[PDB]
Every structure is written in structure tokens, then in C-alpha cells.
């Protein structure tokens, strides 16, 4: 155990709140990065029990802690009111270094699930450029599997372990609140989510092999996990995904129930000015959205989801300690 520095190439200039942020937090990236293969070594990892993905937890805290300050926090009893500024937020890419007399642990095997050997690894002296994008449900700008889709979980026997879906090739999801101000809606070539969960349930199917696999949309819980939600451009986007995780896969082919039309998915989102905090148990509460067309262009790389004959999955997600997992399997810091 020891303590990791982050390596930015964020700018001193830019008054988004990242590179705010890392400008006094993390070191400018190395330009001539090292990595040493050792195809004959063997090591074994586990992505659900690493530190690094509770320093970097601490880190987008502090990071949104300093940055996305809401105009009330209420913790149970308690608010605490401040400045809320409308501030310009785009995440940028992390990496996470160790210092000297420690190194990061690579897994190179383009198959592997996060846990178990891990025949060919590598050193190296950071991770590669993470965004912490912080989501529900989807995961949203991050790398895609180089093989086929990777199933991951803690135990997929445990229902109530999250399932990280990790995708070899991303959708596009177009979220915009267009020039009632607080309603917004998602866009999603239905073309690309149909291949997309006809191959999700495909490797579903080889851990599962009766029991034709089955999505639908979060059996109930507070709105940020029962709904795909997402923040973009400093404001918090809540869409609804019913018509998005509403399909069967049986004998090997796979049918989608959601409604669709002209061949694309439309969710509807709202705009909300409560917020339950992921960071701590409590509420913030933030002001009414900036004027103008609101839009993010993101790719899907992950989805997450939970398990209740048949097995039906639903979209999940919260813990944001899994988001960083999804990025941080492949490595593991050693002395
Ligand atoms: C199986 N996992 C179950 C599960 C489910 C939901 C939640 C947890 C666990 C807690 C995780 C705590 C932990 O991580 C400690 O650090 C966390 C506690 N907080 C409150 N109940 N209010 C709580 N998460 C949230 O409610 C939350 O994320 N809302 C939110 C807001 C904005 C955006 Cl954009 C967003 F995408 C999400
Ligand atoms: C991942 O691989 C390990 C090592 O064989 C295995 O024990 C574990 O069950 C696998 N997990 C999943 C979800 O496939
Ligand atoms: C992605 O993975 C799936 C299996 O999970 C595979 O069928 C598909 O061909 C892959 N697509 C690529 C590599 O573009
Ligand atoms: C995983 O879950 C099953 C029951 O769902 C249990 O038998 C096992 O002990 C759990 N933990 C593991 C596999 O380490
Ligand atoms: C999502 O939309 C469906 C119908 O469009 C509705 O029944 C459901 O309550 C909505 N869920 C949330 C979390 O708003
Ligand atoms: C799938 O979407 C349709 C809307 O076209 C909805 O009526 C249905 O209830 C959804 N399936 C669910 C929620 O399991
Ligand atoms: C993902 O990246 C694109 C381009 O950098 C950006 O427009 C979008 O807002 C990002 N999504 C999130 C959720 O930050």
C-alpha cells in the first residue's frame, strides 16, 4: 500500500474546473512514458479489492468537493449554503502514477475478466488517461475492450454483486437540452443498440447457459440509479431508459421491446436542481440550468447491471467506485 500521484496534461490556462483541479494536484504527464514486458511472469489480480480505486475515489471528491459547489448541502438536519457559480465542466483524461521503489502492475491479456492470472503482464510507471466520468447505468467515455466484449463481476453467482459489461466497440449517445427548460432528450441509433445487446446477451448466455437472458428497465431506488443519468456541461441529465434496456435474447437471437421510431431511441431526460450526492449520504442543491442548447456527444463503453427458468438484467450502478474499476482492472500496484 502506498500513496499514487496523478499526471495531468491539463492547462493553467483553462478555467474548466479539471484542469483547475490538477493544475495544484497532479504532476504534468510524463512525455517519454516506459513499459517493460514480462511475457514469462504470471500475476494475480482482482479488480474489486484494489486501493487505487479508493485514492482515486478520493480524488474526484475532492475534485467535485472544489468544484461543483451546490447552492445548498443539506446532510440530514444541517445545510450548508454557498456561492454557486455556473462553471465550465468537461473531464479530462488521469493518470495515476506510484512513486519511487513502487511500480503498476499491467495485465496485457486482452481477454482477462479482472480477476485470476494473469500470464502476460508489464510495468509501467502510470495508468493510461482516465476520465472520471461520472454515471448511472451507462458508462460513458471510456476504452473499449481490443477483443471480444469481457463480462465482469465480483460473483456472478451473488445477484447482488454489479455486472460491469465492458464493450469492444461504442455506442453513440447524443444527450441535448434544446434551445419547459429543465426537459431534455437522449438520441441513439436503435441499429447500433440492437448489435450491441445481441452480443451482450450472447456472452451473458455463456455464463448463464435454458434461461434465455432478458433486459428490462431498475426495479425501483432513487432516480439517479433508476434512471440513466449523467452530468453535462455542469448540469446533472436524468433519462429515462425503459425504452433502452427492453429486450429479450432467446435461442441465440436478439429482439428488442423498447420503443423506437425512425430507426433511433429517444429517452426523455430531465434537468433536476436536487440532487442526491454520490460523493457522501446527503443532498445538494444546485441552481437552474445555463440558457442555451446543452448537448454532450458521448460513446457507451460499458454498461452496468443486476441480476434478479429465465435471467433478467436491469441497468444499475451508484457506487462510483465502480466506475473506476472499469478502467483500473489491468493494473495493480506493487512495491
Ligand atoms: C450496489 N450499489 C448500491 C448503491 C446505490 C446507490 C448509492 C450507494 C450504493 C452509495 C455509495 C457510496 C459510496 O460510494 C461511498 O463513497 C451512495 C450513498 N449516497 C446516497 N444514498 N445518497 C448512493 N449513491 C447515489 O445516491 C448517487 O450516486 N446519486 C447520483 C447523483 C448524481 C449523479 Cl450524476 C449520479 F450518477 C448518481
Ligand atoms: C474470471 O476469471 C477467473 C479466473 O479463472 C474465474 O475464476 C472467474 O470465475 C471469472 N469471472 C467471471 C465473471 O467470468
Ligand atoms: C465484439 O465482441 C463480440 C463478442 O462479444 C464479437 O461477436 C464481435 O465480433 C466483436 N466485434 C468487433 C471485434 O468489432
Ligand atoms: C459467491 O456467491 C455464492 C452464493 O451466491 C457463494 O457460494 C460464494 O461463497 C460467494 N463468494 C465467493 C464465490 O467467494
Ligand atoms: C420511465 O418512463 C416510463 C414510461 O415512459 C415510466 O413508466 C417510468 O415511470 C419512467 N421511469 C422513471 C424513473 O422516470
Ligand atoms: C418496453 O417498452 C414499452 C414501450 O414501447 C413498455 O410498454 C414496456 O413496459 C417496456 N418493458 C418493460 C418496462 O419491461
Ligand atoms: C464525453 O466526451 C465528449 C467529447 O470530449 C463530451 O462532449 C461529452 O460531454 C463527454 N461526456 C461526459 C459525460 O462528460
Redesign the pocket.
Known sequence: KTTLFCASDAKAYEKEVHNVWATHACVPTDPNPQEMVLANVTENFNMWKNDMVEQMHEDIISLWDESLKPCVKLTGGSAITQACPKVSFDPIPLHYCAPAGFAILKCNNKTFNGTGPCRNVSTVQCTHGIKPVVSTQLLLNGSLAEEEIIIRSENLTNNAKTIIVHLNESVNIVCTRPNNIRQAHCNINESKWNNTLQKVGEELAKHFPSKTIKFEPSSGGD?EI??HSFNCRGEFFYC?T?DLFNGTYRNGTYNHTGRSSNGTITLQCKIKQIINMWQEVGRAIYAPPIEGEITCNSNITGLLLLRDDTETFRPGGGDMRDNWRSELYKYKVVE
Do not use: W
Open positions: 432516480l433508476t434512471t429515462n425503459s
